Amino acid sequence: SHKLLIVNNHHHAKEILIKKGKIFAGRPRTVTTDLLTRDGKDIAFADYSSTWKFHRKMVHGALCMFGEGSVSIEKIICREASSMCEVLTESQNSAVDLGPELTRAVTNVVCALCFNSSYKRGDAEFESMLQYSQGIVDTVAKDSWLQIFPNKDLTILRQCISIRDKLLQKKYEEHKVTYSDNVQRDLLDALLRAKRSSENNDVGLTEDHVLMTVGDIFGAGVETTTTVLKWSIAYLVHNPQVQRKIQEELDSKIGKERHPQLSDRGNLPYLEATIREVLRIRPVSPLLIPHVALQDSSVGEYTVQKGTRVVINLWSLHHDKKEWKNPELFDPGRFLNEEGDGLCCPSGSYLPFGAGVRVCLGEALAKMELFLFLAWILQRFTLEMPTGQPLPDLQGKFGVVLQPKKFKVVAKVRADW
Ligand code: HEM
Ligand SMILES: C[C@]12CC[C@H](O)CC1=CC[C@@H]1[C@@H]2CC[C@]2(C)C(c3cccnc3)=CC[C@@H]12
């Protein structure tokens, strides 16, 4: 038996996430989340703590400084987009599912970021990892509620968890044998280094904490960013006028003798607006992760007892007709100033990455990927539907992230390229 509070109001939501971030920083325990995270030794389901804080810090620095030398995540993202556009080119004018090829690209980013590797098309590990994440995402479809069906199976959930565990366990053991105090190749070395240094001396740096942390970054990095691109492909296809505004922005502000760079960000607010609006309209986590009162508090008038679960309904925040004119329409211009000069936050109701204390750890990285990937593609391609075939159903099932139904697009090369 457990008590629960669903928040449809943004003022309240910011009283939880921010004003009283720490009081509502607890996470909930479920048989499934416990398998996933080893009883909460990861970050995303780890109660607020010096460990939680510390690992969250490791990941921010690892990302800052991966590295190396002079070589940033930017290079790797650009590399992965270049390969995408080469795929789109041979796979060209034909109808084609961008799903799997997009997923690998996003994966090589975070695979680089965590383990200093990449996957090749067809790779057997990568394949295995698509598969097992399938089962995992599918069976964390549980309020961790329209229950009732004989369940479950968490015989298969466990099956996947282990395949994952062996994947990580191999990368862990590999990194050790080649580990060098001078260099730090990735988030794993970063933590291995941390771990050794704890031997020289109550922040938890056991093997489980290391593995679970990297697991979180390897996991989110693929399932979240990838989904958002799939939504952008959908919405782009539905709105040729948005595609075209984006393209003519790229044409004037980057040109044609050159590819987009991250330095270009602040010269392309229409694209940034477009990204924001995808994140508004099909928010990738529509419930965020739940929050748990670590002590009795209040949420303006509502009192709230220690232990109660707390679920922001970001969907309903992002679609209140009171906060958003004509929600349910895709309009990047929500997020642009009166002229188009630059950006403009049209409401306090927008918290796609969350806010305050448990805010998305990958926010920074998600935004870089999303920008480069979409910019690189739209500069060279224009995305239509096949020959004579209805626009994509935008309905979308909710696993651990809210993701769309698959479809086939036609990337036509642009008259210049
Ligand atoms: C691409 C779009 C993404 C969105 C919209 C998003 C959104 C969010 C949201 C809503 C939360 C929960 C906020 C809360 O519970 O208060 C969160 C947590 C988290 N996100 Fe993301 N995220 C995204 C991508 C990523 C990526 C790419 C990573 C890669 C490392 C990542 C790592 C995390 C982690 C570790 C947490 C847990 C933070 C904590 O509970 O302490 N996210 N994100
Ligand atoms: C289950 C899954 C995705 C399937 C992988 O096989 C394992 C995995 C690890 C961490 C989870 C992730 C889904 C997204 C999660 C739940 C989350 C997240 C969710 C949405 C936005 N940002 C972060 C942070 C931890 C992430």
Automatic annotation (TrEMBL):
Q: Where in the cell is the protein located? A: Membrane
Give GO BP annotations, semicolon-separated: androst-4-ene-3,17-dione biosynthetic process; female sex determination; male sex determination; progesterone metabolic process
Known cofactor(s): heme
Tell me a Gene Ontology molecular-function term this record carries: heme binding
Ligase as a keyword of this entry, yes or no, is no
Residue ranges spanning the membrane: these are none
- Judging by the UniProt lineage, the source's domain of life is Eukaryota
Q: Where does heme b bind?
A: R27, W52, R56, H291, R358, C360
Show the GO cellular component annotation of the record.
membrane
Keywords for the protein's UniProt record, in alphabetical order: Heme, Iron, Membrane, Metal-binding, Monooxygenase, Oxidoreductase, Signal
Binding positions for heme per the UniProt entry: C360
Q: Which family does it belong to?
A: Belongs to the cytochrome P450 family.
Protein name stated in the entry? Cyp17a1 protein
User: What species does this protein belong to?
Assistant: Danio rerio
Gene name, please?
cyp17a1
